[PDB]
Scaffold this active site. Sequence first.
Site, short mmCIF file in Angstrom:
data_model
loop_
_atom_site.label_atom_id
_atom_site.label_comp_id
_atom_site.label_asym_id
_atom_site.label_seq_id
_atom_site.Cartn_x
_atom_site.Cartn_y
_atom_site.Cartn_z
CG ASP B 25 -1.95 1.17 1.02
OD1 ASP B 25 -1.87 1.95 0.24
OD2 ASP B 25 -2.74 1.23 1.97
CB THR B 26 1.76 3.68 -2.47
OG1 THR B 26 0.52 3.74 -3.44
CG2 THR B 26 2.95 2.79 -3.30
N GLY B 27 -0.25 4.16 -0.30
CA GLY B 27 -1.12 5.26 0.57
C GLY B 27 -0.96 5.18 2.32
C1 LIG Z 1 -10.20 4.28 -0.18
C2 LIG Z 1 -10.94 3.02 -0.03
C3 LIG Z 1 -11.38 2.72 -1.36
C4 LIG Z 1 -12.03 3.12 0.73
O1 LIG Z 1 -9.85 2.02 0.26
C5 LIG Z 1 -9.38 2.20 1.61
O2 LIG Z 1 -9.30 2.69 2.63
N1 LIG Z 1 -8.24 0.93 1.58
C6 LIG Z 1 -7.50 1.13 2.92
C7 LIG Z 1 -7.76 -0.23 3.71
C8 LIG Z 1 -8.24 -1.57 2.71
C9 LIG Z 1 -7.64 -1.65 1.69
C10 LIG Z 1 -8.11 -3.04 0.84
C11 LIG Z 1 -9.44 -3.44 1.27
C12 LIG Z 1 -10.13 -3.08 2.41
C13 LIG Z 1 -9.53 -2.13 3.05
C14 LIG Z 1 -5.90 0.97 2.70
O3 LIG Z 1 -5.60 1.25 1.35
C15 LIG Z 1 -5.36 2.42 3.58
N2 LIG Z 1 -5.43 3.57 2.52
C16 LIG Z 1 -4.98 4.91 3.10
C17 LIG Z 1 -6.15 6.08 2.76
C18 LIG Z 1 -6.17 7.24 3.57
C19 LIG Z 1 -4.68 7.97 3.61
C20 LIG Z 1 -4.54 9.14 4.24
C21 LIG Z 1 -5.87 9.55 4.72
C22 LIG Z 1 -6.96 8.76 4.76
C23 LIG Z 1 -7.23 7.81 3.95
C24 LIG Z 1 -4.77 4.81 4.73
O4 LIG Z 1 -5.81 4.93 5.37
N3 LIG Z 1 -3.80 4.79 5.07
C25 LIG Z 1 -3.34 4.97 6.58
C26 LIG Z 1 -3.09 3.37 7.17
C27 LIG Z 1 -2.68 3.19 8.43
C28 LIG Z 1 -1.06 3.78 8.82
N4 LIG Z 1 -1.10 4.40 9.97
O5 LIG Z 1 -0.44 3.72 7.94
C29 LIG Z 1 -2.41 6.05 6.91
O6 LIG Z 1 -1.51 5.95 6.41
N5 LIG Z 1 -2.73 6.84 7.94
C30 LIG Z 1 -1.69 7.58 8.36
C31 LIG Z 1 -2.25 9.00 8.16
C32 LIG Z 1 -3.58 9.41 8.61
C33 LIG Z 1 -3.54 10.07 9.97
C34 LIG Z 1 -4.95 10.24 10.47
C35 LIG Z 1 -5.92 10.11 9.94
C36 LIG Z 1 -5.93 9.37 8.64
C37 LIG Z 1 -4.74 8.92 8.01
C38 LIG Z 1 -1.27 7.43 9.96
N6 LIG Z 1 -0.02 7.85 10.16
O7 LIG Z 1 -2.27 7.33 10.59
#
Ligand SMILES: CC(C)(C)OC(=O)N[C@@H](Cc1ccccc1)[C@@H](O)CN[C@@H](Cc1ccccc1)C(=O)N[C@@H](CCC(N)=O)C(=O)N[C@@H](Cc1ccccc1)C(N)=O
EC number: 3.4.23.16
Lengths: 99, 99
Positions: B25-27
Site C-alpha cells: 500500500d503506497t497510501g
Molecule cells: C479508499 C478506499 C477505497 C475506501 O480504500 C481504503 O481505505 N483502503 C485502505 C484499507 C483497505 C484496503 C483494501 C481493502 C480493504 C481495506 C488502505 O488502502 C489504506 N489507504 C489509506 C487511505 C488514506 C490515506 C490518508 C488519509 C486517509 C485515508 C490509509 O488509510 N492509510 C493509513 C493506514 C494506516 C497507517 N497508520 O499507515 C495511513 O497511512 N494513515 C496515516 C495518516 C492518517 C492520519 C490520520 C487520519 C488518517 C490518516 C497515519 N499515520 O495514521
Amino acid sequence: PQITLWQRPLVTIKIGGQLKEALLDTGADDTVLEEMSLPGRWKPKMIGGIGGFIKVRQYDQILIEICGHKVIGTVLVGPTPTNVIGRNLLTQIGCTLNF
Amino acid sequence: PQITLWQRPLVTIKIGGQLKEALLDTGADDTVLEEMSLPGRWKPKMIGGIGGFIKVRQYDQILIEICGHKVIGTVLVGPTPTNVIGRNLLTQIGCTLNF
Ligand SMILES: CC(C)(C)OC(=O)N[C@@H](Cc1ccccc1)[C@@H](O)CN[C@@H](Cc1ccccc1)C(=O)N[C@@H](CCC(N)=O)C(=O)N[C@@H](Cc1ccccc1)C(N)=O
C-alpha cells in the site's frame, strides 16, 4: 515517471475545472475525494477501510487529469480526510509497482 | 519485480515464523497487521484512515521477509481488516511507482 516512496506519493489532479492534490494509493480499489462540487447525478454508496466505514456519492464517467494523463472513470466523493487515487484510475494511466 | 494494478497488489510475507499475505500500500505511511502473536516490547499507539481511528500496538525492530527481501522495521498490530505493508517498509525494499 518513476516515483520513490520516501515521501507520500502526492500528485496534482485536475477534476471538474479544479486543481487538487491527491495521494496515489495502491491499497485502494477505488478513488475517493474530499467533498467538492461535481456535476451530473449519483448513486449513493458505502466504503470502508482502516477505522470503519463512510458514506460517499458515486459519480461515473468523470474526467480527471493526473500528472497530465487524462482518464475517465468513477470517482467517489465524501468525508475522506485526504483525496486518494485508487486502482480503478491507476490502471488507466499504466501505473506499476517496481522493486 | 514489476507489478500491475489490475488486481490487488498482494504478496507473501514471513514474520515471526509465520506466513501471511499482505497488501502493498503506497497510501499508508505505516505497516499494520491483523492480530498476531508477536514477541518483544511495545508502546501503544493510535492510527487513522478513512472510517476513523483504531488502537494498535507498536512493535519495533521486527524482521520481515517480503517477496524474499528481508527488512527490519516497525510493525503495528491491531484490528485492521487486512494486513497492509506501508511506506516505512516499501522504501526498505526499494519499491517505486512507475508510469
Ligand atoms: C479508499 C478506499 C477505497 C475506501 O480504500 C481504503 O481505505 N483502503 C485502505 C484499507 C483497505 C484496503 C483494501 C481493502 C480493504 C481495506 C488502505 O488502502 C489504506 N489507504 C489509506 C487511505 C488514506 C490515506 C490518508 C488519509 C486517509 C485515508 C490509509 O488509510 N492509510 C493509513 C493506514 C494506516 C497507517 N497508520 O499507515 C495511513 O497511512 N494513515 C496515516 C495518516 C492518517 C492520519 C490520520 C487520519 C488518517 C490518516 C497515519 N499515520 O495514521
